[PDB]
Design a protein around this ligand. Structure first.
Ligand SMILES: NC(=O)c1cc2ccc(OC(F)(F)F)cc2n1-c1cccc(CCC(=O)O)c1
Ligand SMILES: [Ca+2]
Length: 122
């Protein structure tokens, strides 16, 4: 869920998970357009992962799961079902992705009107 998303992102990376609440075209609720930068690509990937999770019959925004932060790395589990596994994998992946990026302050609170209606495929 959102709680774990914030936690996992905070665990791995160097910045507040708040830094991704409204960034570029994809970091934040929904998203469309051409990704602005590396961070935005990570969020596009993550949106795709959550879509796949929803298609698999999971609730990515709400479902709780267990995980651990060890040496600024996410370890997933124990998992009670496939949805918990899938969601942790999505969040672990975005956390890892974002940790390897440089932050571009200019894309924080980027205007949605600059984001094109069409997006790269998942
Ligand atoms: N892939 C993303 O957009 C995304 C990346 C990210 C990173 C940290 C984060 O931490 C926070 F919650 F503290 F900001 C939140 C993050 N989001 C996010 C924000 C709102 C909704 C959704 C659901 C997915 C969606 O509808 O697009 C994801
Ligand atoms: Ca998004």
């Amino acid at each position: 869920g959102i709680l774990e998303l914030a936690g996992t992102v905070g665990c791995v990376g160097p910045r507040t998970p708040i830094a991704y609440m409204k960034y570029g075209c994809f970091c934040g609720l929904g998203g469309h357009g051409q990704p602005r930068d590396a961070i935005d690509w990570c969020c596009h990937g993550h949106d795709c992962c959550y879509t796949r999770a929803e298609e698999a019959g999971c609730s990515p925004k709400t479902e709780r799961y267990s995980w651990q932060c060890v040496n600024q790395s996410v370890l997933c589990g124990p998992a009670e079902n496939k949805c918990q596994e899938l969601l942790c994998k999505c969040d672990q992946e975005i956390a890892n992705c974002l940790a390897q990026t440089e932050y571009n302050l200019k894309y924080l609170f980027y205007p949605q009107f600059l984001c094109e209606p069409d997006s790269p495929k998942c």
